[PDB]
């Protein structure tokens, strides 16, 4: 139908402004320590503790199977990111560290992207 077209569309459009708000959000990781899964080779015990893992890679694997239908959906997997870290890393890490920099400097981005998802529609 030309509705499921026009409804495709806005999916690939939704699409191209979450790919930009990703690296937005990933240059704000310069270290990269959100990039990829947490090793369960290096990290055995890790699903012990975190029963929902999240990273950089996986988001974008399902970005661009336009697997997001929404900005709400994306930002979840970007606060499991920084939720995970700050709860398996102590406060005095570089890891939870990073998480509260990414945290904070991430949500001027997606105080915009709101903003324009709303707006564009």
């Not at 080779?41 to 055995?44: A, F, G, I, L, R």
């Given at each position: 139908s030309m509705e499921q077209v026009a409804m495709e569309l806005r999916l690939t459009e939704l699409t191209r402004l979450l790919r930009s708000v990703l690296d937005q959000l990933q240059d704000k990781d310069p270290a990269?320590?959100?990039?990829?899964?947490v090793s369960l080779?290096?990290?055995?015990d890790?699903?012990?503790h975190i029963k929902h893992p999240m990273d950089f890679a996986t988001?974008?694997?399902?970005l661009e199977?336009?697997?997001?239908?929404?900005?709400?959906?994306?930002?979840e997997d970007f606060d499991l990111i920084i939720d995970n870290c700050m709860k398996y890393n102590a406060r005095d890490t570089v890891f939870y560290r990073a998480a509260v920099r990414l945290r904070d400097q991430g949500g001027v981005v997606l105080r915009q992207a709101r903003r324009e998802v709303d707006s564009i529609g």
């Open positions: 990269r320590i959100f990039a990829q899964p080779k290096e990290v055995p890790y699903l012990d988001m974008r694997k399902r199977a336009q697997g997001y239908k929404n900005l709400h959906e994306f930002e």
